[PDB]
Design a binder for this molecule. Structure first.
Ligand code: GTP
Ligand code: GTP
Ligand code: MG
Ligand code: MG
Lengths: 428, 155, 419
């Protein structure tokens, strides 16, 4: 279980993807030219998980968009010239938020060139773990082409783990009314074809920046500061030696009791604004209670409205493993009602000594909570409002789709909701 | 048939063709197979000038299609604020109820069109109006955790 | 004569590291195998003068065994007896037993045969493994099935690590534990369970270690392993062969899980024979949490080591039968072994040197409480079929869960019927 192959698709996918490679390159001591410049050999022990070694470390990253301009903006970022140039795969226009163009026409015209590059990266892997895709669900390319890519990769590599960071749309951030269509069509594909999906909710990211961080007009840069701090925390266990959730498959076996209920709620503490001076690091009690706080969730759901099936928590920084154990035991004790009794010992704790940049103490929560149904219900309600009036359907069906895929996607997502509800009400 | 041409020109935003078609006698209140009129279609697809032209020449601002949708339902759903204002100015029924029990307020609330929600409220949208499942727009805002919308619905 | 030790998965390998480190010290062997004969049961002899463990280490991932290949004992073992695949069992019994374990099982058996061929009188195998890991549970079961076919007359003993939430890193460990106990039961002659919670608690309370690591746990475990295998390595008079373990401890073949109790455990910071013998009946020195006063004894051995006079053992044994309520099943003795060498402790270690020590091995029905605990956690998850799809997708049928569980319910009934 060594190599992970990263794929970033569409504008959102490539923007959060670029930020991820910036952030983990700093943690691992990789500079924008690919040289190692770090001071700890913990940094290099698992470098092969995310980097090819030519002496020069190159991200195992594949960059895709129907929109050609995305190649340019990535390349102009700090690490843009470290990506392998032949791993940029781009089309001629852009899908205009049309999931069907992404999945069936223009995106299907481009996908085999993507798979060629995927194939080529998978061949150099000693022991391929599987795949990590960053995308948004509300656009046309990251959603429609991204999910086509997932299915084609799955059939060609059925024994490897497929993981996504999927950015869920909110009207607070993007007032395009077809995004619930695109999200719902995509969620149907993610239910059947991924092993684990981190739900990055723009609704939650906006609320955090607006209400907690007091940012007047949150930008994508503000949202993405939270995303990248989440993506670094939830991959810490993959990127450094350790005992818990050390690769994608052990993570999955710990986090997924039922194959369809593989949508995770990412939480993070402390929540920071960019260019702020986080002074007075948090205590261990503070990291613990803040991690389970609805206001630190990257999914817009209240965990205390549902129940935790499984949870993983990673503490980063110099602190007492003994007081972490005590605080974690305590928050389960007091809140036992919120943790399903029929999955004993369902909260796992790791403590990793290297903190992220900017912080001396931080923690990351990964929850499989039935409260995630609130996010699915929100998307479903919007989808249904639009679909009942058949608004803009011809725009989709004129690209090869049948109306019945809408119906099938809606019913699958509502089935997903009922399943969360079923285990939420289940008793030992 | 000029009615089917006018419906398609209202939908596509073809202002000149709308004008030439009406001058040849096109039925301003023509309906497609589902009961949508040229005004429903212009309101859906955001074509404000065609909305104004149709209203100045006899379009029924409160026409319903087969599902009980008015133009104002569709403008509120898709989120076209200027069109919502023009429809209300021309006597649109702020509280029209469709076959799902929805009012324009329910649809603007669901889709997060907060500025339209406020306009509808100031024009007397019924905060007590219940959909077929018994929810008012305020229920929708509480059930889905939308605190910005919940505050506006009580201003 | 010979015994072959087999260490499977992370826990089995790392405990193996600690046991052979201790064995080497007990017998005067250096980490390169040189020594300036009783322990020939456990060590072959090159005749460059090199004494090599009759030991195999197997893991489906390389990381833990790579440390043995580049550590202090990098020259102790046969390098072809350090065997690793590339993808581990992912905490999944089914991957250790079927889909991944199948890629390396033949190599492992061929390498065991190589050891077996150097033996003039092989007694059998000592097998070290966790219950909770995918390799420790699934590949062990597979290996024990193959060993039963390929070595039908040989004895097989286990040292098995029973899971504890304090150091657990998988929610599914109760599944792997029941699956491997079911499939190994008919192939194992005697098995010594080590509850990680009991060892953890001893480390905190007797060694004043606030947060025990593996290393702390494993050095304590290996002192207990050593007291159990010393008869095999020092030509004792009790438990001289592997077959004798069954004879002395297992009067009933499915109920083959003795409780180990060890004393004294003293922090690096002297007790009489009567005192350490009394300490054998205190629950805090047990290697498995349970209550022998709520059960019946079927067989008991006391294994002393150090400055121990037989008359003082006989007197102390007389006192405890005439004071305590040690109820033996009616179908009632103590067997005694004395090794006169002083207990050894590792340089590094947390344990004080002591002048005399004892390990009691008692087959008590109270260990059924340990099974009941695992079974109950199994039942909670299985009733919802939580995580079951991971197993069914890795070469296993769903009915194997209920077959394993019914077998555990029979085993619990076996304990109830003996008393
Ligand atoms: N959090 C976050 N969301 C983004 C970002 N960029 C776009 N989005 C969201 O993504 C959705 C639109 O999808 P895009 O990534 O822009 O579309 P695309 O995948 O490039 O597909 P097309 O442009 O239709 O071909 C909306 O919900 C946006 O709010 C970003 O940098 N960060
Ligand atoms: N006492 C002790 N227990 C250990 C050690 N290593 C792991 N464990 C316990 O072993 C169980 C799971 O770890 P390992 O289980 O052996 O897993 P594995 O056999 O390598 O199998 P996979 O990694 O799933 O392929 C848990 O109960 C751990 O607490 C160790 O060195 N000593
Ligand atoms: Mg785009
Ligand atoms: Mg392992």
């Amino acid at each position: 279980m060594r190599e992970i192959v990263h794929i970033q698709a569409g504008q959102c996918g490539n923007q959060i993807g670029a930020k991820f490679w910036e952030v983990i390159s700093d943690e691992h001591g990789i500079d924008p030219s690919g040289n190692y410049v770090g001071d700890s050999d913990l940094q290099l022990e698992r470098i092969s998980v995310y980097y090819n070694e030519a002496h020069k470390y190159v991200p195992r990253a594949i960059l895709v968009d129907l929109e050609p301009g995305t190649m340019d903006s990535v390349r102009s970022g700090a690490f843009g010239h470290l990506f392998r140039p032949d791993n940029f795969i781009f089309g001629q226009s852009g899908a205009g938020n049309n999931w069907a163009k992404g999945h069936y026409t223009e995106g299907a015209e481009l996908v085999d060139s993507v798979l060629d590059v995927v194939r080529k990266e998978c061949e150099n892997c000693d022991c391929l773990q599987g795949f990590q895709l960053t995308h948004s669900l509300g656009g046309g390319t990251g959603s429609g082409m991204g999910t086509l890519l997932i299915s084609k990769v799955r059939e060609e590599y059925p024994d490897r783990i497929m993981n996504t960071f999927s950015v869920v749309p909110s009207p607070k951030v993007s007032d395009t009314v077809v995004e619930p269509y695109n999200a719902t069509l995509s969620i149907h594909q993610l239910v059947e074809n991924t092993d684990e999906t981190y739900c990055i909710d723009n609704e939650a990211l906006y609320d955090i920046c607006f209400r907690t961080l007091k940012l007047a007009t949150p930008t994508y840069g503000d949202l993405n500061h939270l995303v990248s701090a989440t993506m670094s925390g939830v991959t810490t266990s993959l990127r450094f030696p350790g005992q818990l959730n050390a690769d994608l498959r052990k993570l999955a076996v710990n986090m997924v009791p039922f194959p369809r209920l593989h949508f995770f709620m990412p939480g993070f503490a402390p929540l920071t604004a960019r260019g702020s001076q986080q002074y007075r690091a948090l205590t261990v009690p503070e990291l613990t209670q803040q991690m389970f706080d609805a206001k630190n969730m990257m999914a817009a759901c209240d965990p205390r409205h549902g129940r935790y099936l499984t949870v993983a928590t990673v503490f980063r920084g110099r602190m007492s493993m003994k007081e972490v154990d005590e605080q974690m035991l305590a928050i389960q004790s007091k809140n036992s009602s919120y943790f399903v009794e029929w999955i004993p010992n369902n909260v796992k704790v790791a403590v990793c000594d290297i903190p992220p940049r900017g912080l001396k103490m931080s923690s990351t929560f990964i929850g499989n909570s039935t409260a995630i149904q609130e996010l699915f219900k929100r998307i479903s309600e919007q989808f249904t409002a639009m679909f009942r009036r058949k608004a803009f359907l011809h725009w989709y069906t004129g690209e090869g789709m049948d109306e019945m895929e809408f119906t099938e996607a809606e019913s699958n997502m509502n089935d997903l909701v009922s399943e969360y509800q079923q285990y939420q009400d289940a008793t030992a | 048939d000029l009615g089917k041409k006018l419906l398609e020109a209202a939908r596509a935003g073809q202002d000149d063709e709308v004008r030439i078609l009406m001058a040849n006698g096109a039925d301003v209140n023509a309906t497609d197979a589902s009961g949508l009129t040229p005004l429903h279609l212009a309101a859906t697809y955001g074509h404000l000038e065609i909305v104004e032209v149709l209203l100045k020449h006899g379009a029924d601002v409160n026409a319903i299609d087969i599902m009980g949708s008015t133009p104002l339902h569709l403008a509120a759903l898709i989120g076209h604020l200027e069109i919502v204002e023009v429809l209300l100015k021309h006597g649109a029924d702020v509280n029209a109820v469709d076959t799902w029990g929805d009012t324009p307020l329910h649809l603007a609330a669901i889709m997060g069109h907060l500025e339209i929600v406020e306009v509808l409220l100031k024009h007397g949208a019924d905060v007590n109006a219940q959909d077929k499942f018994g929810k008012t727009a305020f229920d929708i805002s509480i059930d889905n955790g939308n605190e910005d919308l919940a505050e506006i619905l009580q201003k | 004569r010979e015994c072959i030790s087999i260490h499977v998965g992370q826990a089995g390998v790392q405990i193996g590291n600690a046991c052979w480190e201790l064995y080497c010290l007990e017998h005067g062997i250096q980490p390169d195998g040189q020594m300036p004969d009783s322990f020939n049961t456990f060590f072959s002899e090159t005749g460059a003068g090199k004494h090599v463990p009759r030991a195999v280490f197997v893991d489906l991932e390389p990381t833990v065994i790579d440390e043995v290949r580049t550590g202090t004992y990098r020259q102790l073992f046969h390098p072809e007896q350090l065997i690793t695949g590339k993808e581990d069992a992912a905490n999944n019994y089914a991957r250790g037993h079927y889909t991944i374990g199948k890629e390396i099982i033949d190599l492992v058996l061929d390498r065991i045969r190589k050891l077996a061929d150097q033996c003039t009188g092989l007694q059998g195998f000592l097998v070290f493994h966790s219950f909770g890991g995918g390799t420790g549970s699934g590949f062990t079961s597979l290996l024990m099935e193959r060993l039963s076919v390929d070595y039908g007359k040989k004895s097989k003993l286990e040292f098995s690590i029973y899971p504890a939430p304090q150091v657990s890193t998988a929610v599914v460990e109760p599944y792997n534990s029941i699956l491997t106990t079911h499939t190994t039961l008919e192939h194992s002659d005697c098995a010594f369970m080590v509850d990680n919670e009991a060892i953890y608690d001893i480390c905190r309370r007797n060694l004043d270690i606030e947060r025990p690591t593996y290393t702390n746990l494993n050095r304590l475990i290996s002192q207990i392993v050593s007291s159990i295998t010393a008869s095999l390595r020092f030509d004792g008079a009790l438990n001289v062969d592997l077959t004798e373990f069954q004879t002395n401890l297992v009067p009933y073949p499915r109920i083959h899980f003795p409780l180990a109790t060890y004393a004294p455990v003293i922090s690096a910071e002297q007790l009489s024979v009567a005192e350490i013998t009394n300490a054998c009946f205190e629950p805090a020195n047990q290697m498995v949490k349970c209550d022998p006063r709520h059960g019946k004894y079927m067989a008991c051995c006391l294994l002393y080591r150090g400055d121990v006079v037989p008359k003082d053992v006989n007197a102390a044994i007389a006192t405890i039968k005439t004071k305590r309520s040690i109820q033996f099943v009616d179908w009632t003795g103590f067997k005694v072994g004395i090794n006169y060498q002083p207990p050894t402790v590792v340089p590094g270690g947390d344990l004080a040197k002591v002048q005399r020590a004892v390990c009691m091995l008692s087959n008590t029905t109270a260990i059924a409480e340990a099974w009941a605990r695992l079974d109950h956690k199994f039942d909670l998850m299985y009733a919802k079929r939580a995580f079951v799809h991971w197993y069914v997708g890795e070469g296993m049928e769903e009915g194997e869960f209920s077959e394993a569980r019914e077998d555990m319910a029979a085993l619990e009934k076996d304990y109830e019927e003996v008393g």
